[PDB]
From a paper:
To examine this directly we determined the cryo-EM structure of a human replisome containing CMG, [name]-[name], [name], [name], Pol α-primase and a DNA replication fork with a 60 nt 5′ ssDNA flap. Similar to the yeast replisome, in addition to well resolved cryo-EM density for CMG, [name]-[name], and [name], poorly resolved density extended from the N-tier face of CMG atop [name]. The conformation of human Pol α-primase and its positioning in the replisome are remarkably similar to yeast, with the catalytic [name] subunit again positioned above the mouth of the lagging-strand template exit channel. Similar to yeast, POLA1exo-cat is invisible when CMG is bound to replication fork DNA but is visualized stably engaging Pol α-primase in reconstructions lacking DNA, where it adopts the conformation observed for apo human Pol α-primase. Human Pol α-primase is tethered directly to CMG via three small interfaces that are all occupied independently of DNA engagement state. [name] binds to [name] (site b) and GINS (site d) in an analogous manner to Pri2 in the budding yeast replisome, consistent with these binding sites being the most important for priming in yeast. The [name]:[name] interface involves charged residues on α4 and the α3-4 linker of the PRIM2NTD that form electrostatic contacts with four conserved residues on α1 of [name]. Binding of [name] to GINS is mediated by the N terminus of [name], with amino acids M1 and F3—invariant in Metazoa—projecting into a surface-exposed hydrophobic pocket on [name] in a comparable manner to Pri2-F2 in yeast. Continuous cryo-EM density links the last modeled residue of PRIM2Nterm (G5) and the first modeled residue of PRIM2NTD (Q17) indicating this interface spatially constrains the position of the PRIM2NTD and [name]. In addition to sites b and d, a flexibly tethered helix in [name] (residues 96–114) interacts with [name] and [name] (site g).
Author numbering:
A (entry chain G): 94 to 223
B (entry chain A): 96 to 114, 170 to 598
C (entry chain P): 1 to 5, 17 to 252
D (entry chain B): 1279 to 1445, 1448 to 1458
Amino acid sequence: RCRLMKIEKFFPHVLEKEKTRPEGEPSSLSPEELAFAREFMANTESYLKNVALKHMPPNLQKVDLFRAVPKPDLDSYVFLRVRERQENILVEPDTDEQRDYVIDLEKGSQHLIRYKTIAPLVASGAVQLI
Amino acid sequence: IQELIEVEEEEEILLNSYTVVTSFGLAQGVSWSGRGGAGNISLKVLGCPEALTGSYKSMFQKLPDIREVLTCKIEELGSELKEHYKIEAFTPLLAPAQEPVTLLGQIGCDSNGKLNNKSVILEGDREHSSGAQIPVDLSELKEYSLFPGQVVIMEGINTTGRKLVATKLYEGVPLPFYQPTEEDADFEQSMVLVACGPYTTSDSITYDPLLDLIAVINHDRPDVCILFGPFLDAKHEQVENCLLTSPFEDIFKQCLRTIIEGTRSSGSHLVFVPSLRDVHHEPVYPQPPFSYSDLSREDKKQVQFVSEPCSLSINGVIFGLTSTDLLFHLGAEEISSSSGTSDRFSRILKHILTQRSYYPLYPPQEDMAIDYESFYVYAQLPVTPDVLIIPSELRYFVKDVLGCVCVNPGRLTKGQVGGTFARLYLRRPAADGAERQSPCIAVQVVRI
Amino acid sequence: MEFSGQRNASYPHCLQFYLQPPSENISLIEFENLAIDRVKLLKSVENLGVSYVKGTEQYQSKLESELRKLKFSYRENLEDEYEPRRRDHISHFILRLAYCQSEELRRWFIQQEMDLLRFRFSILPKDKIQDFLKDSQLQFEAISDEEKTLREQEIVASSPSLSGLKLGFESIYKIPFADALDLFRGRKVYLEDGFAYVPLKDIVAIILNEFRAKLSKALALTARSLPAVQSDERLQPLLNH
Amino acid sequence: FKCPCPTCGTENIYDNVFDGSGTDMEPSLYRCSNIDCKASPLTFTVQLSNKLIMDIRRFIKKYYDGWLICEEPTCRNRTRHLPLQFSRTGPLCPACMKATLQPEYSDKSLYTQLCFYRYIFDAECALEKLTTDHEKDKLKKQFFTPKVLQDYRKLKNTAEQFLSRSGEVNLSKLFAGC
């Protein structure tokens, strides 16, 4: 159920990313999920076009859902617990280089940090979100 | 103009919406270009005991410092040559000797004039000779080649203890060559451009030779460009009379900006070396690197500023860099009985490489303001270079001396008229080789 | 939760004892005026002396105004007073050479220094005393403090100058009679079996005495060793006039 | 310090921040020394800074040229070469072999000259050194606006760059004394 919420919420972005994907990298969608996403995209566009956009002046009948629909917010804060030791992780407060510094993640510890910095560790299986 | 064009574009769109002088290494016939710096190029600066990365406390030496510098150079290279020739000991210069005895010292002149075969003196070390001096007769030597400031070892007769009859002269010896890494093996044939100021005719600040060189760089797309000062010549007429309407430093920054923005499309990497003729920059040899700030991130990855002199590793190939006119300075001061085929510039280059220094001449030539402590710390070789770049007002050349490819590009202008620059090809020899061959395979000198 | 993220070492306190040479650089006008303003201060201490009695509140109130006006170190501040402290340190080293020109001038500036030190030691809060006595070589360990009330009775019976309250607020600790030398040889106060029941001001007297000894040795060194440094001496006549 | 005027070619001489004295004080950069010329040196401070660079480089070069002269008045030998045979009073001269050599233009001399160059364009210091408030007010209100002070400051900075490159008293060396 949770994966399906995220597909319905961000449909143009997941579709375009899968269309762009290079060979050998894993997909974010199973084949059935991709089928469902394609159906959802077509259905939504058709509804808006039939209800209002065909009546607009000729210069305004096109709209871009890729621009209208928001994007996933990777700067979200999360709690985590680490399963393998990691070293030289860079933390950036603010965005002035004079405040950058590095830390090390010891085995079995728990931390609160921005999702964007740790994203490869979650995909690799080094950490757990709690 | 442009703002109105963009306004009209917006208006039209909104309205319509509702409707060769010298060659070396068989360079000829081969095509001459680079990969625009796009290959596995790498640039690294070397120095011993350290590299000249920034400015120093100039203008404040004392004579014991100068004495110490000269003494240390005498004793260091004398110890190296003692071990090389397996000499047992050095006799003091003040000690009388009826039979020949071996002596360590430095060549000098008895007076402020140019050295000649009658004005020669030998000045000793502190360890064995207490810094004493002795006049020399060279006529009993079968051959010789000498200049002031040169550290030498001699064997001779000294019956008075106060005048030396030289019977044998021990030659100076260069350092070992560099040993390039595996990173210096993961690269392919590359092209290096060499040019030296003034980048102007000495009557006009119009920088026409600079634009010609920029066009050359864009046309050939070299991999590296080594650019030696003066970028704003103190001997230029408008500079000397101080008539220019902008500060010298701002004009120099404009010059660097012109090179960098003009050549950015080439991709070529840029190396900048100063000269004492750079009016805006420090007048003291060794000079620290220039100071500059207009670089974008691409330019920061492609542009590097270095000292005068400097030792640069280009893909593992060591380039010795000095804009100084040491060729003219030593040509005015070297003496010899080498009446055979040993060419004048060959002897000068051999002296540069054997004395292991980018300015072994002492006292220095009349324009060379030398800081001797910085010269001792920075102006000595870390290794024998593969390529020795040494511009001069004297005529351009290329020569293979002791295994080092010595290049004189001349200057980019002969005062009020156009001059010359140079181009080099690098390709490391095969790793199966039992002995070093030159990694520089071809060189040419070209007019601007 | 537990979170994650230079000149302090030079002068952790406003007090300083000139053990370490500041191995750095100076400007000509800088060392000149750093010393000369303190010459004015040396005269000013005794001008205040001829104005009224030494060390009173009138002295205290005027003296701190001199320091605020003259930008040298203070009753110790928590912000960057380390700059005034290093200025004080550097300028002290500079002051060694001017009035070494005569022993009477040496003694004159030494005397105003002792007056200034006595003032500073008079100002001290308790925390300053507690941390400086431990952070300095001036340790002077206390022994068996619970006995002080038996000496609250005995000293009070035995002393004209001391009193029961002084036992606590001029907090009493045990050290030998010799550290209270003027008090044993004058036989002024309760000392027993060679031991003195001592407040801070006796250790201040010892601080002043060893300061004088070390400073006198330094002044002898100033008279002897200095000639290599004497490439310039143009200020010395203006300083001795 | 000397420099030619770009407008009329006369060589102007500078010895202070000011020309004149007393109530007749004026900026040394205010007007050209040619009485028939309208030109103001505050309009060619760039050329003056350029000439200042050349002259300071000449004096630095003079220091580094290596000229030495003997102390003994019967010898007076002049040389560019430092003999390594030192003695209790420095390098022993090869002409007399009885007295030592000394520089013709020393580091202290060059430092003094660089300070002088800095001083003659240090308008803020010169204005503070005036002995009456009337002179300070007159010179500030009539001539030394922030623009004029910035011009003088550019010339001061031109000298200060060489001072910053020079070897500023080393505090550590004073402990070579006591």
